[model samples]
Target chain A: MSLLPVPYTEAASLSTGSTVTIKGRPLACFLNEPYLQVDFHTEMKEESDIVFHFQVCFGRRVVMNSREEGAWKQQVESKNMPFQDGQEFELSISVLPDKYQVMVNGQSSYTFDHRIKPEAVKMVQVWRDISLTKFNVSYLK
Target chain B: SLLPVPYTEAASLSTGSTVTIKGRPLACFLNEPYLQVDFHTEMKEESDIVFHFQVCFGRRVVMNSREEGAWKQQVESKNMPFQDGQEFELSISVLPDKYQVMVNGQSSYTFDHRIKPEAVKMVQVWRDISLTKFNVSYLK
Candidate 1:
């Protein structure tokens, strides 16, 4: 059993003939909840174009997003992820009214500015176009 | 005012010294929920006594708490120094029983152990005694 009550949905690979993809939605709506954490695996294929994007939103307003090249929303468009295929990565999020502290693979990646109201962060989407496995979520106090 | 840490102590420093090893196990850890930082030695230390910068629920104690050769795990940091003199760009973010410790610009440890919720406020700097560069920004 997983920590979160959400159902995990594996998506079909996009234009890229990637081996795996994943997306999930929690059963309970996220309403100003202070924190959320996730752990999963990522494939590290040589010359791979696979980049997993984790997004948190209140409908369309993006309250949370990933960073690239030491900045936010910069889009990591490369095949240089140093992870190996089937390698797991953990993500922990500490959400606040105006900002968020994000940790990837157990390291702080970036702190995001809240683009929408905290109450609107009712959904989280984890979409990838490569092998992803062993996904889990846990609620923190 | 709290000092941004990374201190060095040939001897266990005192509580009022900005950063020190106050007791055998200072109970300032995340007994409930809090953040943590752990990493590898991008640089080596001058002492055999390993150093660390630990912040817990502010209620637990610290032992010579070595995980005892647990160094063979998929996410263990290579025995490194927790002092502040050796400089390298290592970063991390942690929470509640959740911790994210990075080493030399890479991820090292991710621990999510449960603890008491009320004990979450003491932040400590375990070693390296130089306070020339430390900063923190708080929010409302």
Candidate 2:
């Protein structure tokens, strides 16, 4: 099944040694916007705090940001892009004690250091032009 | 997105292996609707079939298979727990001498082995569903 504005709260909340796999495709008009963001928030409330934000700016770079106390942090940038419009791909975010290891299509893509405890992440939100085919959390422990 | 039919690949099946198939049946359910799962020794037209299981829903729920050039006796059961256009999860567990099938988290049926359990090298899925998750996990 596919869901727009896919909200996976419990599934994306990962602990150390756990992984969240998001399988989906970018929409046909994915490049219509400058980027897409996969955000992990603290809860499902309006203006809720964000723990981690994974942003993929089309044809440019990937940026990781976090918000604490209504304040956004500096964007941590990655040089390469592993996603394309109209293509099916699998993205896995592995939670570590210190950072999140993100893999795109089975290849290691980026490492975003944890600004807060990764286990405290309670909700996952995907924004802008992506069709989610599956979202699941697998515990390695 | 549509997943390719007859998904065949090397399997990590053993006595405690559990295979989970997550998908939803199509809207054309009353038509020629059937789903089949086969575990075989090789990927050929005619190979040693370890376990062939099929389910068909029409006038009645019928399960059968062809083995060694002969069709086995049809096993009819009322436990078919699927509906049109609804998402379902089916799990098959490999036991010591039989395959325990579960539909929507309930026990459905069991099929005894016709060949050695270790001989099955590939697992295949076919027909009438849009696959979302196909995963196999080996239990310790």
Candidate 3:
């Protein structure tokens, strides 16, 4: 499949059993420190409040946070780097009852407790230095 | 017909060069569409940026330089001359010590030379906007 654009945004909704699956690759190699950000926003507007903010500093670390009323809340940082240097990766984020579980390449890599209800998410934006090939939200449940 | 966006052009600059752009935002001010103009040290998008100018329309404008894969100090301002949902004329002129940004013929921003303007080999204008024209002048 051809690469999708960077800064891809899609309208979305989430529930406790929903899962977002994504496949993408960094535009730059690890030595150059590319970034990937996935933000679940409360509204379709880009400046809306966020329910989940996941930022991956490729080959370095991951940071999670939420924005409420235009201000960033507590930050969760992790050094658990499960992502490869230059290869494509599959990322799965599931909405659990209490937290969001992140699976990188099928490995459980991180988790963040809900700062805001998953149902508040009206948009999901996958942006920064990566090209997306696939983005799907599972509704089987 | 509007030109294809995410425009990139091999460019060169000196103390007296001027780069001009004409474009319009893809969405209204309420949607926070972005506009980014980067002057790069190389043709590749990953290369160091001699000057990075970004506008989050109706919100703020930020300017910075990235050297050796690291961003330098940032300069930010709230002076947005760009009218929402309207076409804009942008000019960036290289002066002896700084680059002056003019929006709609009014001076809006400036960034001192962290790296020589002569080192810039490419210019990329991208992010949520449709570019109609992009020009780099070689006239001294």
Candidate 4:
């Protein structure tokens, strides 16, 4: 079979010492605009509040924001995308004292300050045009 | 999940005929794939194409025909109904004047008939997709 099923959702508990790691590959070529999204939500429902919203449009831009009470806050746009086309991606989201640090392929890529407490995140949803192979959340701290 | 690629079938169509396909692009993010369907005048792969439909997934749809082994006028459309990572149901219905294409229950494209549907001898589906189901209606 292929990678794991898409629209993958998992109940999660996060804190200052937690780290989330994801291994995935895009399903289309960069010329056609493939996208990948990772959202940290406060609940299991689709409409729940998002503590962290990360959206990457391959070969284009990456947008980050937080959804509060169904309304999105100030969006953060970045062009420093390090994802390689036609290659598997390694993503790590580490929770620091004051912000979330993102690393792509072991190299720091992006960061967003905490808009809400990390303890508020109860679910994580990974979706869009990518095939997920592995998802792990470290809880030993 | 083990459907064939570059699949071919002997088929026929008429004014009331419909060709249905269930498939999904082989890949999506950072990897633009393609899907193509051709209606040929003969059983051979080198035969003239009566209707050539090509899709650049998440991008555009292109239509054309080949006569005497030469391609004719081409039509391009940017109206895309395909989701980024989802399977799609495609239906092509032969009309009196044109071929109507439906994607996921929405009419997406149309191409005027260059040669009568009765001239088609073979149908081929190929490119970057895995076809799970393909059907042709002979109801007419």
Task: Pick the TM-score winner.
Answer: 3
**Candidate 4 docking category?**
incorrect
How many pairs of residues collide in model 4?
Answer: 13
Candidate maximizing DockQ? 3
Task: Quote each prediction's TM-score.
Answer: 0.23, 0.46, 0.76, 0.60
- Report chain A TM-scores, every model: 0.38, 0.86, 0.98, 0.96
Kindly report which residue stretches of model 3 are placed more than 4 angstroms away from their true locations once superposed: A5-13, A28-35, A42-49, A57-61, A68-72, A79-81, A84-86, A139-141, B1-6, B24-35, B46-48, B56-60, B66-78, B82-87, B127-130
Tens-place lDDT digits, model 2, residues B27-74: 234322456676767655345456666656433454544456455677
lDDT of each: 0.30, 0.68, 0.88, 0.86
Flag regions of model 1 displaced more than 4 Å: A1-86, B1-140
Alpha-carbon deviation at B54 in model 3, angstroms: 3.7
Candidate 4, superposed: residue stretches over 4 Å from native: B1-140
lDDT of 2 by residue, A1-141 (tens): 756332234435578998878887654223222345677878765256778888775656888888788778888888887877557888898998789999999999999888889777777766433556777778887
Q: Between prediction 2 and prediction 3, which has the larger TM-score?
A: 3
- Give me the runs in candidate 2 sitting further than 4 Å from their true place: A1-12, A29-34, B1-140
Instruction: Spell out the clash pairs found in candidate 2.
Output: none
The per-residue C-alpha lDDT of model 1 at residue B131 equals 29
The digit string of per-residue lDDT tens for model 4 on A18-100 reads: 99999998865575356788999999776688999998989899999998977889999999979998899999999998999
| Candidate with the larger TM-score of 1 and 3 | 3
Q: Second chain of candidate 2: TM-score?
A: 0.82
Sort by TM-score, top down from the best: 3, 4, 2, 1
Native contact recovery (fnat) for each candidate is 0.00, 0.00, 0.16, 0.00
Tens digits of lDDT, candidate 1, B62-140: 2221122222212233334232223333332434444444545556444542332122223323321212333222222
Candidate 4: lDDT over CA atoms? 0.86
